[PDB]
Amino acid sequence: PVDFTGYWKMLVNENFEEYLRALDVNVALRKIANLLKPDLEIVQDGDHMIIRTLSTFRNYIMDFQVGKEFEEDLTGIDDRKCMTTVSWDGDKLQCVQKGEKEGRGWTQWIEGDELHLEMRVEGVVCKQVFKKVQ
Ligand code: NA
């Protein structure tokens, strides 16, 4: 179906403060996190994906098989651990992160030449949109 491989630059980042607050991130980290505009670097081969969130502060790496639950170490974000599953929902990717926080997960898809990422926790929705540099 869809190949997310690319270096994706952030265009839109809505409600990130609210999202981090819901994860109990301290204000000092939130202050700096919001000015950050992390890139997304994705390499995919079939059901195998590495998704790197790249910033000047901290990087976050997700390295998984679609459909295979794994222990996700959210070191650098809220430093929690989740039981995480990323699933194919047609061409969309749906991630559920089971753990402390209810309703934690995200949805990722491509519309035209933009990558959309919706991250959720406890009913907060953060909306991100990315584009490659042509
Ligand atoms: Na790996």
Side-chain angles (χ1 to χ4, degrees):
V2 179
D3 191 349
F4 292 95
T5 302
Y7 194 94
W8 298 93
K9 290 198 67 163
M10 182 174 277
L11 292 173
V12 175
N13 191 11
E14 298 181 19
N15 265 27
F16 194 53
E17 164 70 13
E18 285 83 354
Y19 174 84
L20 291 181
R21 190 186 315 122
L23 292 183
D24 307 299
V25 175
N26 68 47
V27 191
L29 287 173
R30 294 204 318 267
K31 180 212 291 294
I32 279 167
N34 225 141
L35 302 161
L36 301 174
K37 291 169 288 182
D39 303 320
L40 277 190
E41 183 200 276
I42 305 180
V43 298
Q44 181 184 340
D45 181 5
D47 282 347
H48 178 231
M49 295 176 65
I50 301 177
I51 300 174
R52 306 178 65 219
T53 306
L54 303 181
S55 87
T56 54
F57 178 50
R58 287 202 180 106
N59 299 326
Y60 180 65
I61 315 304
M62 283 194 87
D63 176 344
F64 59 86
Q65 294 300 320
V66 179
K68 182 162 166 288
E69 182 171 66
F70 66 100
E71 182 192 327
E72 189 181 9
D73 269 86
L74 286 134
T75 166
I77 303 179
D78 61 342
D79 298 319
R80 290 188 173 95
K81 283 169 178 49
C82 292
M83 292 310 280
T84 297
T85 309
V86 182
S87 301
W88 285 114
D89 169 23
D91 285 346
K92 298 201 193 206
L93 283 176
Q94 297 284 3
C95 176
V96 178
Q97 297 164 303
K98 286 168 166 348
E100 177 57 19
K101 301 296 184 176
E102 114 190 349
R104 190 183 183 155
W106 50 256
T107 307
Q108 184 173 286
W109 72 100
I110 285 163
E111 222 162 84
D113 52 15
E114 298 196 313
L115 182 153
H116 293 254
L117 174 58
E118 173 177 296
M119 303 185 321
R120 300 171 297 270
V121 62
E122 285 179 347
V124 176
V125 182
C126 167
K127 161 174 174 176
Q128 299 180 347
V129 188
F130 302 79
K131 203 169 186 158
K132 303 182 281 191
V133 187
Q134 304 164 38

